[PDB]
Copies of this chain bind each other. A is one copy, B any other.
């Protein structure tokens, strides 16, 4: 992987692995999401980091509030996928975008965008971005807007409602194992995507392909918490409303939507 000529974006190639594919012999959405986080980490490392010097002084971290992924073609086992930046969104937080391409044809096969908010590591209290922090990362971002999802009214910015009981489908008693934890023993963001998809019926997975997924992150699941995954059909295309909540008290951890197209 490497930063581009202007040093304002990062590119990396990945060869799709045997254990990374589903029944279609193409990468799962969870493998794509893992590759997006890997290229994001490599971009932060290449530019000097993604906590800045002022963030470490105040015990502040970047946390994901929303993830949005759109896939036109899932790369097959053995294929090479090329993934390509960050932007300041004022005092609200930051945004990270990705473009996925087939290495052989050069065509865009997917795109993703994510919203990040500033949070104190210890109290877990959200806050706005200060000017000192904002100026420290602006030298690594394009100055003009560069959007993976430019369109006037697009799916990446839609407000998601809260699923009402009873859910049409459900998967109960989901728990993270050590492989679901990151280097700081926190549940990996990609695990929640997998948990959301656990309540989609197998017949939908067998006859449709996942085109879009939008996930809001409200609260972290601790490695000792238990999760329930709920889904209701809202709709050639199928749409679903999703809700992840703590098995006991029913505390919301995530809400999302998926859009699937017939194979």
Contacts and interface: CB of A to CB of B under 8 A. Distances in A.
A188 B20 CA distance: 11
Interface string A188-229: 101000110110000001000000000000000000000000
Contacts of A19: 34, 37-38, 182, 188, 190
B190 A177 contact: no
B23 A38 contact: no
A17 interface: yes
A77 B174 contact: no
B28 A178 contact: yes
A90 interface: no
Contacts of A22: 178, 181, 183
A58 interface: no
Contacts of A197: 178
Interface string A28-56: 10100010011001100100000000000
A244 interface: no
A67 interface: no
Contacts of A182: 18-19
Nearest to A17: B38
Given A183-B25, A184-B23, A178 B198 contact: yes
A83 interface: no
Contact of A38 (B18, B174, B183, B190): B18
20 contacts: A17-B34, A18-B37, A18-B38, A18-B41, A18-B42, A19-B38, A19-B182, A19-B188, A21-B183, A22-B183, A23-B183, A23-B184, A28-B178, A28-B179, A30-B178, A30-B179, A173-B173, A173-B175, A177-B194, A178-B194
Pairs A-B, 3 closest by C-beta atoms = A18-B41, A179-B194, A17-B38
